Copies of this chain bind each other. A is one copy, B any other.
């Protein structure tokens, strides 16, 4: 029963991944706006004499807005990533799997981990960088849920489960905060 985020080396690699995804989005968005700004200033610089230069900024602006939508599609996937980790770690694992009592309780536990492992993610169209690193994190949860759920079918196994998953929690919260900061940053980009 390995938990990829129970190891500090994996957690850092994953936090970097998200940082890299956040920073890239910032850099690229600026790059697009600098191009867009530069385009506008140029047409303004020769607006009296060169009338055709006005045709360009609108073309660069229509793209800039398409680009912003993709960046916000990325944000949306990141927030669902934050939600997902809360539902796995806090609602399911700590809420149910650590507080297991009755058949009717674990009836929730093993199912609720199954519903989690069965969930998939909308990819970010035109942003395969975001799709790849986000799916990688989404799927760590799916795999950890599955593993945990297979290791039922009691009270002995649960104390081992709790103890074994414990090192993963700080890992998960580390990754959740990275995603949460990436999602926050996107909202602030247009400023």
Which residues of chain A have a CB within 8 Å of any CB of chain B? 24, 28, 31-32, 34-35, 38-39, 42, 45-46, 48-53, 55-56, 59-60, 63, 66-67, 70, 125-130
Contacts and interface: CB of A to CB of B under 8 A. Distances in A.
Question: How many copies of the shown chain assemble into the complex?
Answer: 2
Nearest to A52: B126
Contacts of A130: 49
Given A49-B24, A129-B49, A63 B70 contact: no
Nearest to A62: B59
A5 to B, nearest CB: 23
A48 B129 contact: yes
Contact of A60 (B46, B50, B52, B60): B60
A78 to B, nearest CB: 15
Contacts of A48: 128-129
Contact of A128 (B39, B51, B66): B51
Contacts of A129: 46, 48-50
